[PDB]
Amino acid sequence: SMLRLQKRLASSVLRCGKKKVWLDPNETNEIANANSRQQIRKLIKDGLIIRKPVTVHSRARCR
Amino acid sequence: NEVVTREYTINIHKRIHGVGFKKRAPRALKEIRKFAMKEMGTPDVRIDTRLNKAVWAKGIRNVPYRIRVRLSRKRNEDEDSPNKLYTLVTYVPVTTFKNLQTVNVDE
Amino acid sequence: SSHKTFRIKRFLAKKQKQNRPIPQWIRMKTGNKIRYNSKRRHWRRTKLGL
Amino acid sequence: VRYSLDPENPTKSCKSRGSNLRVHFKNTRETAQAIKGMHIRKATKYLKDVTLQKQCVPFRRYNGGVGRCAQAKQWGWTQGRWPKKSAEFLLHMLKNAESNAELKGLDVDSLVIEHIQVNKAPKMRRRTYRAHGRINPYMSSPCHIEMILTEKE
RNA sequence: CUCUGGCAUGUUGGAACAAUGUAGGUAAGGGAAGUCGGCAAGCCGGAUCCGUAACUUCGGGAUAAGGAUUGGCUCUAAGGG
RNA sequence: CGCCGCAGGUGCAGAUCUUGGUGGUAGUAGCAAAUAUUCAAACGAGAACUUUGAAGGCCGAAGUGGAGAAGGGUUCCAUGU
């Protein structure tokens, strides 16, 4: 339903911003059940939460 | 039949002409939705996210002049809804729009 | 602020405990004549004296 | 409760009522005048058409600054609008009236809105802030609505 | 202009594209004839190489004024540990 | 409450009168400073505004980022309405 808490906790656990937190849009119910940082860690291990990669800023043009 | 699917090309350039810069892409998806309701006669029109990307591919003001879409009229026999039929419009990538007709596409 | 004296903190403590709704059973008391806590204070509308 | 204009006989009649409803009195009064005397099936479509902006309500008394529309010609008028919130509130009350009609065991296909009335409800106060440190009222104008439906065919 | 980080356009949206406005542009030919008054706008503008007057408290004036060049690509010399 | 006496803080249209209430104005002025939103899905009676995903943008490190002092005082955090 609402996952504002989960995205905040995933950001803290992954040590990234909320930009890079990816919550599986299909498995919303399982993520909604996670109310603890331990539960978020299990979801990160299970692939339901993913740290998205850094947006590419190439220096090939500058080089 | 009523579960027919057809492939069209829409002159976005014609339907967007005159719209301001910050409204061309949002208006392009309204004309695409209006186009689908006309040919498929279904108020419920779902636009695929990949088609939404294609319209917004070149930013908000430089919308592609032409887009090749595919209108699929399908049954809504999945839940209690006022409309038993809905149209799903998807994106058909093409290399050229020359000599492209409206063609009936099979299953 | 974060740096506060004990008196200021104790003063804020009392103002916090007394900013609560009246208990429901109060209206059942004979000759109550009280509807709601008229001394409710919100932190944003009205500021404390200090 | 006390309605104004009791029905000619309260055996072929059903009543519905609402108090302190958050709809503009002026818009609701015009919408009520349009559906007054309508058959209940006609009023239900008409109110749905107002929501879809296929039919309008003519603004006859509270018409200051109200624009002109082509659909106002069905009525002998020039000014009309499409009060969506007024249409919904009257649609809910019509459903309640029809449910009351079914409870009294009188058929709902012959109901006609013989009485409908919109009254001022006590205003509710909010605030607006003006140019030179001034506060002005920002009142709401709720309304009481009542209606009586009778059988005729 | 972009990455990390952040946000949803600043207390509403939809449809049109009339006048008048607010903000921003362009305009042939003329060039301040406008106006109390060049108000407003416009011109100029960076860097390199030249070249700079009256006057002066000799310090300045001075970026005075005025003129030329400026892209891309392929090189060639010189400047070190 | 009438009648005989007695006694007044004893009669309102005004005082830009006092207090309270209510109109026309009027469904009007208005909800226009800082570029911008769109698609799909979920929950839900109900979605332009909530959440998730996707896309397009903005702040562009002198930030619309990360933390403090003063001031505020529970606004912090969960759940629910």
Ligand SMILES: [K+]
């Ligand atoms: K109109």
Ligand SMILES: [K+]
């Ligand atoms: K218009």
Ligand SMILES: [K+]
């Ligand atoms: K002049």
Ligand SMILES: [Mg+2]
């Ligand atoms: Mg304050």
Ligand SMILES: [Mg+2]
């Ligand atoms: Mg007027």
Ligand SMILES: [Mg+2]
């Ligand atoms: Mg104001």
Ligand SMILES: [Mg+2]
């Ligand atoms: Mg002020």
Ligand SMILES: [Mg+2]
């Ligand atoms: Mg804007």
Ligand SMILES: [Mg+2]
């Ligand atoms: Mg907005």
Ligand SMILES: [Mg+2]
């Ligand atoms: Mg604000």
Ligand SMILES: [Mg+2]
């Ligand atoms: Mg000219």
Ligand SMILES: [Mg+2]
């Ligand atoms: Mg000229």
Ligand SMILES: [Mg+2]
């Ligand atoms: Mg002159």
Ligand SMILES: [Mg+2]
């Ligand atoms: Mg003159």
Ligand SMILES: [Mg+2]
């Ligand atoms: Mg000037």
Ligand SMILES: [Mg+2]
């Ligand atoms: Mg000089």
